[PDB]
């Protein structure tokens, strides 16, 4: 009569069906245009306006996924996807999420599933030791790590913990004097966290960075701004140095910044959402030097660690600061209770993803995975440098190369040349790159991180960039870009 | 040579293994004790202290899942799980997450995956119309809906939107005077949202409720507290009436609450995290009457709508109020294609619309209505068995598929509370069933929440049998001195 929506045999049959559907997708993803070519509003036209009253077959639904959903996808998993930062995935990460979705437990507390809490603390110590984090960040020592969804939520929680730590000493009425510090390259997640956490919009600082420092935040500039804020009656609270900025993969020097922060009793959060995973490699560990003097450190394992979206790894020195700000149990009372470390109460079993990746691939293969991305980007950088019509705009640090086509007021023309040039390349659907404007310079970003990407795809992307460079420069007139 | 971590054939091979592993789990879940019986710290001692340098096989990991992970699980998917609220799942919803994790796109904006944005707006209109929400909550009309992870996140976003709307008019310096209003039964997600949003802790209100009103918030009591706050120089900002409270599934009357809230220009968010999905059935739609006068409305589709953890559904009359607070564009550009990241906290959004789309299509409105109805019937059946046993008592009216009850002794309250605490823990310790409790109005009561998808009538009857046999056991050897401590 009525089949249970979780019937084991129907789960088995349809599950095998979708596995085959997805394996075919990874096999054929290259045939699709990378950036979706549908028009806004395409899907509402093709779909009914109301839910169906009677059930539809999984066979019919899967066909609609092929005809209606897949065209409206920008294929982050395409090997020719080089936009933004990678949606780094893997078989192991996918299986860990499906085991998490299969068990479907709610990690509201330890008792709700003890493994969903204890496995998280183990793998965060695993990951932290591979990162060579100090014992002050590990359960092994005096710290701790927590898995979250995104970096914005992680930054939000460390910010409220920093806010509550200061306001509980000086009074809640001073919230309108707290200043949050970033660079003009810091990701929009910091400003959003400050807006949600009640920081005054006029008290967010995006400190100017300079080409002479490759747009990394100078501690000398940070101290100048703090003294200005202190003279204006404000209270410096929070600074967020970034390793691997999203625009140009700039790197803020953590140790000089923390030195300035301790003088003014400021919380330091190190944002390494993308590049942090590379410090698993000994030759890249120097990029987070000085993290031992910071209060919190975060990276997105879904960006450059194969887990699949989403898995944010947050290490803190003082988890009590998170609990004091995020727990709802009375202030006096304020086993691990992870819900008091983050926003989400109905936590997902995210540690399975990280556990699967670490076990299925091991430290050695994971290092070489990240190294292969960096090496393919180093090759792309070498190909650019051998073509005198191009220019590397900032030093490459982690697997992303920023470059621009040069023209054969001059900056505005060059910027327009690269916007048109990039746009014709993306319009082919053969590859996908995004851009950034750093120091007034419109530059193209080539971020090699898609798991399916091999050297032949990077070389193929170089061929298309060269062919389109031949096209635009061959018929170049500066009046065509002087508008 | 090393194989690509996303190799299609290896994905196919290992994927089929997990599907078989999970199907075996659903087939055999009844054999495990529902509440995990491990000791704290068991896992750290069975697992290595460092990550392995060399790869391990999926067959080895899977065996470790069986011997190390599964024992440390409390099986929310067990048909004998009646604790808290359900972790409502289904085949269709699991497959939606599978396709979402398989495509693994990032819904940062419309261009990053147009389908990941447009499908969400379609299905939210689908669900909203199934809930008979007014057009002011739909994209067809004046409003819109957004999919988030959890209701606390959804309440936080809605609260900061209400905060910014007020503070943009009167000035940011008045944040220390804003007051957030809830009942003493309101879920702690509201208080957590107020703590994050910068609301002063002494300006959070947990207004007292009374057994005479089944612990629903009285609009007259709410108006009394507001006048006290106004007379004390405070600014009432935000009230969150609940349909289906967590402890006793109480329901707050929405219409008179917004009437009070309209008088003092307050934002109203209707929290229906658990019970909200039931109102797609016309005979339960009356429970959210008055939502036409609220500003926002939320339910957890992972709680009672089969998606899977997690899927929170938030409808708002004015999405621009969310954009004004959550956008990082400068304030003059927010002051004017959907960009869902500005409706919520998450920037790197997940393709959550697949889950909801899959559930709605694979089962349809009629079958989905009957799924929820069957849970209510089974709970009403459980309620009937309780009344026929004179040793038990129903403590609050049953509203949506959760029954509150307690064992009665042969103050009396302290002894009765201690009796039910011992009684409940002895039942949960068997591992045959799992139910949690709540102290409402000074009364310790046991909660029986029928929502796990695999739960059938035989499981509810089985749980009633377990409760009766323990009742016979506790009361057969009853002595007042055994509980008067």
DSSP bridge partners of A444: A403, A435
What are the distances in angstroms from CA B450 to CA A7, A416, B277, B454?
18, 62, 14, 10
Contact A69 B326 (CB under 8 A): no
A276–chain B nearest CA distance, Å: 17
Note whether B376 and B384 are within 8 A (CB).
no
Calculate Rg over the CA atoms of chain A.
Answer: 24
Residues of B in contact with A337 (CB under 8 A): none
| C-alpha span between B161 and B271 (Å, rounded) | 16
Q: Which residue in B53, B77, B363 is closest to A103 by CB distance?
A: B77
Note whether A215 and A439 are within 8 A (CB).
yes
| C-alpha span between A220 and A230 (Å, rounded) | 15
Chain A interface mutation, best of B101, B154, B271, B298, highest count of A Cβ atoms under 10 Å: B101
First to last CA, chain A: 69
Note whether A115 and B43 are within 8 A (CB).
yes
CATH number for A287: 3.40.640.10
Residues of B in contact with A138 (CB under 8 A): none
Q: Please give the structure tokens belonging to residue A451.
A: 């798991």
Residues near B72 by beta carbon (within 8 Å), at least 6 away in sequence: A113, A114, A115, A116, A118, A119, B36, B38, B42, B43
Residues of A in contact with B68 (CB under 8 A): 115
Contact B345 A5 (CB under 8 A): no
Chain breaks in chain B (C to N over 2.5 A) after: 336, 410
| C-alpha span between A90 and A450 (Å, rounded) | 10
How does A69-90 read in b/e, with b if 16+ C-beta sit within 10 Å? bbbbbbbbbbbbbbbbbbbbbb
A403–chain B nearest CA distance, Å: 22
| C-alpha span between B332 and B325 (Å, rounded) | 12
| C-alpha span between A206 and B288 (Å, rounded) | 45
Q: Is B481 exposed, middle or buried (0-12, 13-18, 19+ CB in 10 A)?
A: exposed
State residue A439 phi and psi, 5-degree precision.
Answer: 65, 30
Helix (H) or strand (E) holding A391: strand A390-392
Q: Is B48 exposed, middle or buried (0-12, 13-18, 19+ CB in 10 A)?
A: exposed
| C-alpha span between A397 and A381 (Å, rounded) | 11
Residues of A in contact with B92 (CB under 8 A): 5, 58
| C-alpha span between B17 and B33 (Å, rounded) | 25
Contact A43 B115 (CB under 8 A): yes
What are the distances in angstroms from CA B403 to CA A338, B400, B426?
29, 8, 19
Residue-wise DSSP of A253-294: -HHHHHHHHHHTT-EEEEE-TTGGGGGGSGGGGGGGTTGGGS
| C-alpha span between A177 and A200 (Å, rounded) | 8
Chain breaks in chain A (C to N over 2.5 A) after: 334, 408
Number of A–B residue contacts, CB under 8 Å: 452
Q: Which residue in B4, B15, B41 is closest to A19 by CB distance?
A: B15
Q: Which residue in B22, B65, B112 is closest to A11 by CB distance?
A: B22
| C-alpha span between A444 and A421 (Å, rounded) | 10
Note whether A307 and A96 are within 8 A (CB).
yes
Q: Is A261 exposed, middle or buried (0-12, 13-18, 19+ CB in 10 A)?
A: buried
| C-alpha span between A100 and A120 (Å, rounded) | 13
| Chain B residue with minimum CA distance to A121 | B44
A368–chain B nearest CA distance, Å: 10
DSSP bridge partners of A370: none
B480–chain A nearest CA distance, Å: 31
State residue B183 phi and psi, 5-degree precision.
Answer: -90, 170
Question: CA angle at residue B426 from B420 to B430, to 5 degrees?
Answer: 145
Q: Give the strand pairing for A400-405 and A441-447.
A: antiparallel
User: Is residue A296 helix, strand or coil?
Assistant: strand
Residues of A in contact with B55 (CB under 8 A): 359-362, 365
Q: Please give the structure tokens belonging to residue B83.
A: 């604790």
User: Is residue A133 helix, strand or coil?
Assistant: coil
Note whether A271 and A187 are within 8 A (CB).
yes
Residues of A in contact with B76 (CB under 8 A): 103-106, 112-113
| C-alpha span between A198 and A178 (Å, rounded) | 10
- DSSP symbol at A146: E
State residue B224 phi and psi, 5-degree precision.
Answer: -60, -45
Residues of A in contact with B306 (CB under 8 A): 5
| C-alpha span between A180 and A85 (Å, rounded) | 25
Q: How many CA atoms lie within 13 A of B397 on its CB side?
A: 10
Q: Which of A103, A118, A335, A131 is nearest to B46 (CA)?
A: A118
| C-alpha span between B351 and B102 (Å, rounded) | 10
| C-alpha span between B102 and A249 (Å, rounded) | 28
| C-alpha span between B261 and B258 (Å, rounded) | 4
B110–chain A nearest CA distance, Å: 8
| Chain B residue with minimum CA distance to A58 | B362
| C-alpha span between B451 and A104 (Å, rounded) | 13
Contact A27 B6 (CB under 8 A): no
- DSSP symbol at A65: I
Contact A99 B346 (CB under 8 A): no
Residues of A in contact with B188 (CB under 8 A): 328, 345
| C-alpha span between B1 and A227 (Å, rounded) | 56
Question: CA angle at residue B368 from B362 to B374, to 5 degrees?
Answer: 135
| C-alpha span between B352 and B100 (Å, rounded) | 7
Max Cα distance, chain B (Å): 76
- DSSP symbol at A420: H
Q: Please give the structure tokens belonging to residue A353.
A: 């993803």
Question: CA angle at residue A349 from A348 to A351, to 5 degrees?
Answer: 130
Residues of A in contact with B58 (CB under 8 A): 95, 360
Contact A102 B94 (CB under 8 A): yes
Q: How many CA atoms lie within 13 A of B166 on its CB side?
A: 23
What are the residue ranges of helices labelled H in A29-176? 42-46, 58-64, 91-103, 114-130, 151-170
Note whether B219 and B260 are within 8 A (CB).
yes
| C-alpha span between B179 and B163 (Å, rounded) | 10
First to last CA, chain B: 69
Domain carrying residue B188: 114-360
Residues of B in contact with A123 (CB under 8 A): 51
Contact A36 B65 (CB under 8 A): no
User: Is residue A85 helix, strand or coil?
Assistant: coil
Q: Per residue, what are the HEC states of chain B?
A: CCCCCCCHHHHHHHHHHHHHHHHHHHHHHHHCCCCCCCCCCHHHHHCCCCCCCCCCCHHHHHHHHHHHHHHHCCCCCCCCECCCCCCCCCHHHHHHHHHHHHHCCCCCCCCCCHHHHHHHHHHHHHHHHHCCCCHHHCCCCCCEEEEECCHHHHHHHHHHHHHHHHHHHHCHHHHHHEEEEEECCCCHHHHHHHHHCCCCHHHEEEECCCHHHCCCCCHHHHHHHHHHHHHCCCEEEEECCEECCCCCCCECCHHHHHHHHHHCCCEEEEECCCHHHHHHCHHHHHHHCCHHHCCEEEEEHHHHCCCCCCCEEEEECCHHHHHHHHCCCCHHHHCCCCCHHHHCCCCCCCCCHHHHHHHHHHHHHHHHHHHHHHHHHHHHHHHHHHHHCCCEEECCCCCCCEEEEEECCCCHHHHHHHHHHHHHHHHHHCCCCECCEEEECCEEEEEEECCCCCCCHHHHHHHHHHHHHHHHHHHHCCCHHHCCC
Contact B196 A197 (CB under 8 A): yes
Q: Which of B222, B219, B226 is nearest to B256 (CA)?
A: B219
Note whether B375 and B450 are within 8 A (CB).
yes
The dihedral sign for the CA sequence B158, B159, B165, B168: negative
Q: Give the strand pairing for A400-405 and A390-392.
A: antiparallel
B232–chain A nearest CA distance, Å: 17
């Amino acid at each position: 009569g009525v089949t249970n929506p979780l019937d084991p045999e129907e789960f088995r049959r349809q599950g095998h069906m979708i596995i085959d559907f997805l394996a075919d997708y990874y096999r054929d993803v290259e045939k699709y245009p990378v950036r979706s070519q549908v028009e806004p509003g395409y899907l509402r036209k093709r779909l009914p306006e109301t839910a169906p009253y009677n059930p539809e077959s999984i066979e019919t639904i899967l066909q609609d996924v092929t005809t209606e959903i897949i065209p409206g996808l920008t294929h982050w998993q395409s090997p020719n996807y080089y936009a933004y930062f990678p949606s780094s995935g893997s078989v192991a990460g996918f299986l860990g999420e499906m085991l998490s979705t299969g068990f479907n437990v709610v990690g509201f507390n330890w008792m709700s599933s003890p493994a969903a809490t204890e496995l998280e603390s183990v793998v965060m110590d695993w990951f932290g030791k591979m990162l060579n984090l100090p014992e002050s960040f590990l359960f092994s020592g005096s710290g701790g790590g927590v898995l979250q969804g995104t970096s914005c939520e992680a930054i939000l929680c460390t910010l409220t913990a920093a806010r509550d730590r200061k306001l509980n000493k000086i009074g809640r009425e001073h919230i309108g004097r707290l200043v949050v510090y970033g660079s003009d390259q810091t990701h929009c997640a910091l400003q959003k966290a400050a807006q949600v956490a009640g920081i005054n919009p006029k008290n967010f600082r995006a400190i100017k960075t300079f080409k002479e420092n490759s747009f990394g935040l100078s501690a000398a500039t940070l101290r100048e701004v703090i003294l200005e804020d202190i003279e204006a009656g404000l209270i410096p609270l929070f600074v967020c140095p970034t390793v691997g900025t999203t625009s140009s993969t700039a790197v803020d020097p953590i140790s000089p910044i923390c030195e300035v922060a301790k003088e003014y009793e400021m919380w330091v959060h190190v944002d390494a959402a993308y590049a942090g995973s590379a410090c698993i490699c000994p030759e890249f560990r120097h990029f987070i030097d000085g993290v031992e003097e910071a209060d919190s450190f975060s990276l997105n394992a879904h960006k450059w660690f194969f887990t699949t979206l989403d898995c944010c790894c947050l290490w803190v020195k003082d988890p009590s600061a998170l609990v004091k700000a995020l727990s709802t149990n009375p202030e006096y009372l304020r086993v691990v209770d992870y819900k008091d470390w983050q926003i989400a109460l109905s936590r997902r079993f995210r540690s399975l993803k990280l556990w699967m990746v670490l076990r299925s691939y091991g430290v050695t293969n994971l290092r070489n995975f990240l190294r292969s991305h960096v090496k393919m980007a180093k090759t792309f950088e070498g190909l650019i440098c051998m073509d005198g019509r191009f220019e590397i705009t900032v030093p490459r640090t982690f697997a992303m190369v920023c470059f621009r086509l040069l023209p054969p007021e001059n900056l505005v023309l060059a910027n327009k040349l690269n916007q048109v040039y990039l746009e014709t390349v993306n319009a082919t659907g053969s590859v996908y790159m995004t851009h950034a404007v750093v120091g007034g310079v419109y530059m193209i970003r080539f971020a090699v991180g898609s798991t399916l990407t091999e050297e032949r795809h990077v070389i193929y992307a170089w061929k298309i960039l060269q062919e389109h460079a031949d096209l635009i420069l061959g018929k170049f007139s500066e009046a065509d870009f002087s508008s």
